[PDB]
Symmetry: D2
Subunit: 256 residues, 4 copies
C-alpha cells in the first residue's frame, strides 16, 4: 500500500495504459478519478474498479472542460496528490501529406491538453502547499523523429520538454514532475498505430507486428503492466529527489 | 562564392538572424526571397542588397499566406533550392501563469509555422526532383526545459523533432533537412549580463556567429548530413 | 520486503553510498556480499550490517581478484542475482594539467573495473540461466563534460555506454543492465582551489544551485537501487536514470 | 583556400579518413604533418601529397612518442594551429567474451591516445597564445551502445565526453575543441550481403566515404566556426540523430 490515502487523476483512463494505472493505484490504496471524453466508457471503467474510483467526463482540448473536471475532482476528493497525463491520439503521414486537421487534433490532445492539465494540477498543488506528483506519458517517439510520424513525435518531444520546464519550476513547491516513455505497447495501443500505417506500406497482414516485436531487444512488445511499477514509484517518497526526468520503459527499444 | 545559381526563401527576414542570413546568402551569389509579416520592414533590406533580393509578405501562422508566398517565390525564381525557417516569437512565464494567448501565438509561429513552411518547400522540391535544403532554427531551449520558458522550450523541442522526422523522410528525394541551435543571442537587467558572462566563449551570441553554419548546411559539402541539429552557442550547451 | 531470498554483490561497499545500498538491500530481505579493496574496512562494515552481510576483499583493478571474489560469493550463496557496480574514484584537473598517474588510477576503477565486474556477473548469470540484475553507478558527470573533471566525466560517460551495450547484449539471457546517475552527493580542497574557493564555499554554491534545494544524500538513491533490482523493472533495459534533484535532465 | 598558412597534425593519417583529410587540408593551403605508428606508410603518403606534407612517426599509446612527435612538428612548422585526432582501432565481441588484450589496445588508441595528443596540442596552443583548433574523431557508436561493440562504443563515448570537457576548458585560450561522428564508412564470426544491408539501411542510401567528412573537417578549423565549442557533429547520412 505504497499510495495509501493519496488521490490521483488519470486522463484517458477508460481503456489501455490509463485503465491499468487506475487499477494499480487503487490496489496501492489510492482514490482515483478516471477522466475521458466519453462519459459512458469512464462510467463502465469505474464500475470495473469499484468504489475507490470516480468517473469524470473531460475534453482535455478545451480549457472550460479542464477547469470543470478539476473542480469536480477537488470537490469530490478535497485535494489532488497525483496527476497522470495519459490522454493521447496517434496519426501517421509523410510530412508532405500532413493535413492541418490531423496536426491540430493530435497537438491539441498530446501537447496542449497535457500542458493545461499539468497547469490545472500545478495551480491546485501550489495553493494547497503540501506538494504533489505530476507524471506525463511521453514515448520513444518523443526521443527521436521518424519518417511518417512527424506530428506524433513532435507532440511527445514537447511533452518531454514541458516535463523538464515544469519540473524545475515546480520542485520548490514540493511538486515532482517526471515522465514515462513507453516503447511499442501490444494489443489495443499497437492496433491504433497499425491502423494509421495502412495507406503507406501495410506489409502483409500482421507480419509487421511480429517483426517490430522481434526487433525489441527484450523480445516482445510491451504490456501495460510493464509500466505500472514505474507509475507507482514516481508517485512515492522514494522518488522525491527525481525531478524533470523521462524514464524509458521500452524493453531496450531506445536508450536514454 | 558558395551558393551561385541557388535560390533561397528566409522567413522572419526583416531583422536579426534572418536579415544576416539574407545578406550572407546574397554575398554567396544566391537569389533570396526575404519573407516577413510586414513587407515594408523588408523593402529597406531588399533596396540595399539589390536585385538578387525580393520582398515577400508572408505570415507563417496562416496556411493561405504560406501558399501565396511559396507560389510567388516559385513564380519569380522558377524554383526554390533552400528554405530557412527563421520566423520565431519568444514568451516567458512560470507554467502556473501561462495564458492560452501566449501559448497559442508562440506555438503558431515557432512550431506550426516552421512545420507547414517545411511542408510547402518539400512538396515543391519533391516535384522538381533536383533535391534541396531546409534549415530550421532550433535553440539550446529545445534541448532541455528551463523554469520560466516552458512554451518557447517546447516549441523548439518540436522543431528539433520535426527536423529529424522530415530529415529521414525527405533524404530519398535529395532534400537535406537540418537545424541550427543558437545559444543566448543579443536580442533587473542582472540576468541577461549574468547569463552573457557565463557563456564559455566569453560573450552572448550575435547573428554572424551562425552564418558560417547557415552557408555550410546549404552546400554540397553537407550532402551526407541528415536530420541533425548543430549547437552554435559558444559552449553554452553540449550536444 | 522487495528482495526476499535475493543475493547481491556491491563493490566499494565499506563506506558511503555502497554501504547505504548494502544496508537498504538487507532491510528488503537480501543477503549482501560487501566487496572492497580494504580487508579491515570491509570486515568492520559487515560487523556493522550484521549476519545477512558477508565480507569479500576485492581489488576491482585486477582480473585475478575479480575472478576470485565472484567465484567465492557464488560458492557462499550458491548464486548471485544482483551486482551493484559502485566502486569509484574522483579526480579533478584542467585538461592541460592531467597526469598519467591520475588518468590511469580513475580509469582503472571507474571504467575498467566496472566493465570486468559486469562481465564476471554476466558470465555467472548466463551460466545459471535464471537471468539477473546489474546496476552501474554512473553520474551527471557522464552526461556532459565540464572544464575541471575531464577524466572523471569521460570514465562515467564510458559507464553509461557499457550499460547500454551490455543492456542490449544481455537482455536475451533475462539480465537487466541499468544505471543510476546521481547528481552531487554529500580531493574536495584540490577541486575547490581551481576556482580559488575553499571546499566549504564550493559545497554551499553547488547545494544552492540544485533545483530541489540541497545536495543529495545516499537515501535519495536507495529507492531506485531497490526498484531496478525487482520484477517491476523487468522491461527496463540499458537505461541510465538521473536521481539528481533536477541538477541534470534526461 | 580556407586554411592558407595554417599548420595541421593528423594522427593515423597513412590511409582512409586521415589521408583524405591531409589531401583536403593541403588543397586548402595548409601545411600538414601526417603522423602514424608506421613511419614508412606515412613517408609514402607524404611522397604522393607533395612538400606541403611532412611525415612523423608517432605511437599515440606512448607518452614519450607523443612528446617526440609534437616536438618534431613544432620544430619543423614553428607552431601548430590544428590537431585532428583520427587514430582509431576497432574490435567486436559480446561483453561476456571481451578479452583484456582487446580492451586495453582499443582503449589505449581511441581514448587514451586521443586524450594525451589533445593535451599535447592544448599545452603548445596555450603557450603560443594565438588560439587553435582540435578536431576529435568520434562515431555514431559513441552516441549509444550496441550488443557486439561494447569496447569500441565506450571508447568513442569517452572521446565525445573529453571533446566537451576540453572544449569548455580551452575556449578561454581561443582553442576550439569539437568532434565529427561518422556513421558507417566504406571504409564476421558471430553471423557480399551484410555490408550493403547496413549500407542500404542508411537513410541517405549508401555507406559513407571519406569525402562526406572533409567539408566538416575544413569548416571546424576556420573562423566561420569560432563560436562552435565542445560539439559533436553527426555526418552519418541520417543513421543517427543528435
Amino acid at each position: 500500500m505504497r499510495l495509501q490515502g493519496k488521490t490521483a487523476l488519470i486522463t484517458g483512463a477508460a481503456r489501455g495504459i490509463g485503465l491499468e494505472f487506475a487499477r494499480a493505484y487503487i490496489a496501492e490504496g489510492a482514490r482515483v478519478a478516471l477522466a475521458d471524453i466519453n462519459a459512458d466508457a469512464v462510467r463502465a471503467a469505474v464500475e470495473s474498479l469499484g468504489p475507490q474510483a470516480v468517473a469524470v467526463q473531460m475534453d482535455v482540448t478545451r480549457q472550460d472542460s479542464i477547469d470543470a473536471g478539476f473542480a469536480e475532482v477537488i470537490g469530490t476528493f478535497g485535494h489532488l496528490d497525483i496527476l497522470v497525463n495519459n490522454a493521447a491520439l496517434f496519426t501517421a503521414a509523410p510530412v508532405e501529406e500532413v493535413t492541418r486537421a490531423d496536426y491540430d487534433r493530435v497537438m491539441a490532445v498530446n501537447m496542449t491538453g497535457a500542458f493545461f492539465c499539468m497547469q490545472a494540477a500545478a495551480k491546485h498543488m501550489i495553493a494547497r502547499g503540501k506538494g504533489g506528483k505530476i507524471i506525463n506519458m511521453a514515448s520513444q517517439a518523443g526521443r527521436r523523429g521518424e519518417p511518417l510520424v512527424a506530428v506524433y513525435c513532435a507532440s511527445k518531444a514537447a511533452v518531454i520538454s514541458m516535463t523538464q520546464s515544469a519540473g524545475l519550476g515546480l520542485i520548490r513547491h514540493g511538486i515532482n514532475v517526471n515522465a514515462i516513455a513507453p516503447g511499442v505497447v501490444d494489443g489495443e495501443h499497437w492496433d491504433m498505430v497499425d491502423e494509421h500505417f495502412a495507406r503507406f506500406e501495410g506489409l502483409k497482414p500482421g507480419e509487421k507486428k511480429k517483426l517490430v516485436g522481434a526487433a525489441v531487444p527484450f523480445g516482445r512488445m510491451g504490456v501495460a503492466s510493464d509500466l505500472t511499477g514505474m507509475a507507482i514509484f514516481l508517485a512515492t517518497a522514494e522518488a522525491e529527489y527525481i525531478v524533470g526526468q523521462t524514464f524509458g520503459v521500452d524493453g531496450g527499444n531506445w536508450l536514454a
